[PDB]
Design a protein around this ligand. Sequence first.
Ligand SMILES: CC(=O)N[C@@H]1[C@@H](O)[C@@H](O)[C@@H](CO)O[C@H]1O
Ligand SMILES: [Ca+2]
Length: 157
Amino acid sequence: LYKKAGSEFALDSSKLEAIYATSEADRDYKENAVDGDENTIWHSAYQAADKLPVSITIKLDKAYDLNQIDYLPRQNSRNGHVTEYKIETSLDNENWTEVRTGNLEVNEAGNALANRGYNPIRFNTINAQYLRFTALKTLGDTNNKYASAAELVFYGK
Ligand SMILES: CC(=O)N[C@@H]1[C@@H](O)[C@@H](O)[C@@H](CO)O[C@H]1O
Ligand SMILES: [Ca+2]
């Protein structure tokens, strides 16, 4: 029911730009969520007053008909693994449509995502030049405080 990385629709990460994120920590910048690279992450701040939700806004080079993104969790650590999320889109970065909400399954222990590769998230084909991805629940040494993402893969025409 999903599509894999070899969909004719998989936008190239060169098409994407992270224009905004609630916060960023260390050297884990918003740009690392859409650089096509498993080995870089976006991580949000984890100071004392930092809590969820956090979100990141991806700008596309034109407006696309999107119907799926893949979420690639941080490969070396479960810190910031997103387990509940929200997806919104817009043409103008001011008026958002709420596309959907949802969860990703945890492993047996409950300490990391069950699927450590591309977790596909499909939705009904909507036209967009901006997508806001919002982490609602997350894992980490402290749960539900900070989020990370290794990649967001977009699909659309
Ligand atoms: C190298 C590394 O893992 N750094 C993490 C950091 O990204 C963040 O998750 C922080 C919050 O607890 O924990 C650190 O250990
Ligand atoms: Ca990356």
